[PDB]
Each structure stands twice: as C-alpha cells, then as structure tokens.
Amino acid sequence: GHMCQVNIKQKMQELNNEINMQQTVIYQASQALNCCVDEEHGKGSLEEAEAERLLLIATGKRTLLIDELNKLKNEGPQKGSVTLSEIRLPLKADFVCSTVQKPDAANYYYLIILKAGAENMVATPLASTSNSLNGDALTFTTTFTLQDVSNDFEINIEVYSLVQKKAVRTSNFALVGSYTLSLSSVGNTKFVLDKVPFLSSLEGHIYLKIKCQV
C-alpha cells in the first residue's frame, strides 16, 4: 500500500536531493582516497579498495539520477517479476596462477553492478580470488529482484576490476565487461560479456540464474 506522488515537483526534488547526497559520498570517498599517500596511511589496503568501490557506486547512481531527472523535465503535458542470482565470474587459469606465484605484486578486486531502472542499481561487495573462488569462477552473494516489471525489461550488468599494485576523482575500478539481460535471456545461464578488455583476467563469460514470473 503506497501513496502516489502529489506532483512532478516533489519527484524532481527527491531526485535532486538524492543527486546531492550521492555527490557528498563522491566528495568524501575522494577525500579519503587522497589521504592514501602510503601504506602507513592506508594505501593498497582493503579499506582503500572499499572506498574505490563506494566512489564507483555513488558515481554510477548519480549518473542514473541525472538522466531520470532530465527525462522528467522533458515530459509533455499530463506485471511480472525477474530475479537474478548465483552470479559467477570465471577467470583465466594463468592469471590466477600469477597471483599464486607472485602474490605480492598486486591485489585484485572485482565487483558487479546491476542496473535496471534509474533508482534501481545494486553493487555486489568486493570479491577476490582469496575469498570467492569456486572452481575457476568468482561467486557473488548477491540476489537481484525486480518487481512490477514489463516484458521489455532490460537489466544492465557491468563487471568491474580494481588493480592495486605494490578535488573530486574517478574510481580506479575499471569496466571489464558488460551485458544487457532481457526477456530473451530467460532460461539461459551462460552469457558472453561484451567490451572485455584485450588481455584481461576474465575468461569472458558470466554465469547466472534467472527466475522470471509473468
């Protein structure tokens, strides 16, 4: 049981405020990352990686809000569900071996961003080969459930990788793959990632379970 918006201004204001909140997070994650001048001050730590993740998330969310708001301001005069789960990201065996044979060279973190609507974005926690690897793939705890959804739904998956070796800024998490799930993806469990960087750690597929009710 939910109340409908009173007017278009209230919605715009809500979006506007959320944009400003996200910018605060961006600014603060930036200020924290700027303090990471050395290992004594947190450089190359997990804490730093988490800050990079938050910067990424707030940046991405802010972008969706901006687009929605621009959409609202250009409007003219005035059921089903999809569930994603058991996400798995297979890595190349040779990459993994390098982390074993040269474990002090770098730290590697991965995450997944799931975006459907503009107010519909979720990011998995950080995953690493140290704590998420089953077989040759990273396992994610994350379940993503989309309600009151139409049959032309799209869910954008973005895979990010962070490499740590040995004024507002941009997250060091880099986009290492993307895929758009739609109705035609239903019943499938293995998808070919687009935009995978030349010579990346990713095997190039992503695995997941899609439940769907209409």
Curated annotation (Swiss-Prot):
Compartments in which it is found: Nucleus; Cytoplasm, Cytoskeleton; Cytoplasm, Cell cortex; Cell projection, Bleb
Tissue spec. comment: Ubiquitously expressed. Present at highest levels in the brain, at high levels in the placenta and testis, at intermediate levels in the intestine, ovary, skeletal muscle and thymus and at lower levels in heart, kidney, liver, lung, pancreas, prostate and spleen. In the kidney, it is widely expressed in tubules, but sparsely expressed in the glomerulus. Expression is significantly increased in renal biopsy specimens from idiopathic FSGS. Overexpressed in many tumor types including breast, colorectal, endometrial, hepatic, kidney, lung, ovarian and pancreatic tumors.
Recorded superkingdom: Eukaryota
Entry PTM: Phosphorylated during mitosis.
Biological role: Required for cytokinesis. Essential for the structural integrity of the cleavage furrow and for completion of cleavage furrow ingression. Plays a role in bleb assembly during metaphase and anaphase of mitosis. May play a significant role in podocyte cell migration.
Subunit structure comment from the entry: Interacts with F-actin. Interacts with CD2AP. May interact with RHOA. Interacts with FZR1/CDH1 during mitotic exit.
Annotated disease: Focal segmental glomerulosclerosis 8: A renal pathology defined by the presence of segmental sclerosis in glomeruli and resulting in proteinuria, reduced glomerular filtration rate and progressive decline in renal function. Renal insufficiency often progresses to end-stage renal disease, a highly morbid state requiring either dialysis therapy or kidney transplantation.
Protein name per the record: Anillin
Protein's organism: Homo sapiens (Human)
Lineage: Eukaryota, Metazoa, Chordata, Craniata, Vertebrata
